[PDB]
Design a protein around this ligand. Sequence first.
Ligand SMILES: [Cl-]
Ligand SMILES: [Cl-]
Ligand SMILES: [Cl-]
Ligand SMILES: [Cl-]
Ligand SMILES: [Cl-]
Ligand SMILES: [Cl-]
Ligand SMILES: [Cl-]
Ligand code: NA
Length: 129
Amino acid sequence: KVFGRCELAAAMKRHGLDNYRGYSLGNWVCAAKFESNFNTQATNRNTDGSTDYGILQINSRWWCNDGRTPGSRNLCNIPCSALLSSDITASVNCAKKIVSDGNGMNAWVAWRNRCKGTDVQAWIRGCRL
Ligand SMILES: [Cl-]
Ligand SMILES: [Cl-]
Ligand SMILES: [Cl-]
Ligand SMILES: [Cl-]
Ligand SMILES: [Cl-]
Ligand SMILES: [Cl-]
Ligand SMILES: [Cl-]
Ligand code: NA
């Protein structure tokens, strides 16, 4: 599913991301924009052989099982395919574990490079929330 910007903001709020670990909703919407362009089915293979999945491009090296990432962990205890659902529950639940891990949203390289420090509130401006 390709979410609309405000549609995803509403879904992320409903699922408890707004100010999760002190990160405002616009941070999460921004990270989803540049990670997946709001497409739940986005995938991208990394040079290390791991793959990133879903709206927040959660990686198979640590966080989910895809059966093809040697030496990897599955700390969210989910198949990576769960991260491609129209329903964002699995992605959100896993993202909350990732953002709790120590480096906050710096775990998402696109967030650090394209959202951090910017006027992220622009990403929710206009939306009925
Ligand atoms: Cl947009
Ligand atoms: Cl915000
Ligand atoms: Cl694996
Ligand atoms: Cl394969
Ligand atoms: Cl594990
Ligand atoms: Cl699995
Ligand atoms: Cl933090
Ligand atoms: Na894995």
